[PDB]
């Protein structure tokens, strides 16, 4: 098979999975151009740390109707952005839950910019994460943020790790 996916997506029309991929790859000063006519976009990334190295793809899949059999079989992590300023912010993730149950990825991250008392506050985000098996991450909290996403992905045992 091919290399693993970390599937990256967004439930907001005003922040894309591609932009989140740019922040993640930015942790190592990698600049990415995201303009492809392909409906799904794969960005290669060599995870390298003191334990192992692993080639993966950050797979930007804008909606569930773009999940092929091949993509589904490769998903080993799931990162999903939601708009916590909207009261419907968690409801907007609901369409991904059947797929997340099927994939059973060992890293599942729910990402917002900052929890919000008139939108989705910390308590409600945390209860959702308990029920569905996600970790809550804030990109701009009042490790955390994109560094925590990178940390969590570096602590994943990918199917193709090469141990040091």
Site of interaction with its own copies (CB under 8 A): 1-3, 25, 27, 29-38, 41-44, 46, 53-55, 57, 70, 160, 162
Query: Closer CB to its own copies, residue 26 or residue 98?
Result: 26
The alpha carbon of 58 is separated from its chain's Cα centroid by a whole number of angstroms, namely 8
Cβ contact 62:138 at 8 Å: no
The CB-of-25 to its own copies minimum distance in angstroms stands at 7
As to burial, measured by CB atoms within 10 angstroms (0-12 exposed, 13-18 middle, 19+ buried), residue 35 is: exposed
Query: Closer CB to its own copies, residue 3 or residue 90?
Result: 3
The CB-of-59 to its own copies minimum distance in angstroms stands at 11
Query: Closer CB to its own copies, residue 4 or residue 119?
Result: 4
Cβ contact 103:72 at 8 Å: yes
The CB-of-42 to its own copies minimum distance in angstroms stands at 6
As to burial, measured by CB atoms within 10 angstroms (0-12 exposed, 13-18 middle, 19+ buried), residue 112 is: buried
């Amino acid at each position: 098979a091919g290399v693993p996916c970390a599937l990256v997506t967004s439930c907001s029309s005003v922040f894309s999975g591609d932009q989140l991929v740019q922040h993640i790859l930015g942790t190592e000063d990698l600049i990415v151009e995201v303009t492809s006519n392909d409906a799904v976009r794969f960005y290669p990334w060599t995870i390298d740390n003191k334990y192992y190295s692993a080639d993966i793809n950050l797979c930007v899949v804008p909606n569930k109707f773009l999940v092929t059999a091949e993509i589904a079989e490769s998903v080993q992590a799931f990162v999903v952005y939601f708009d916590s300023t909207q009261k419907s912010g968690l409801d907007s993730v609901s369409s991904w839950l059947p797929l997340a149950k099927a994939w059973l990825p060992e890293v599942m991250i729910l990402v917002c910019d900052r929890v919000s008392e008139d939108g989705i506050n910390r308590q409600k985000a945390q209860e959702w994460c308990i029920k569905h098996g996600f970790e809550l991450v804030e990109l701009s909290p009042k490790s955390t943020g994109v560094k925590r996403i990178v940390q969590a992905l570096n602590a994943n045992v990918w199917s193709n790790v090469v141990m040091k």
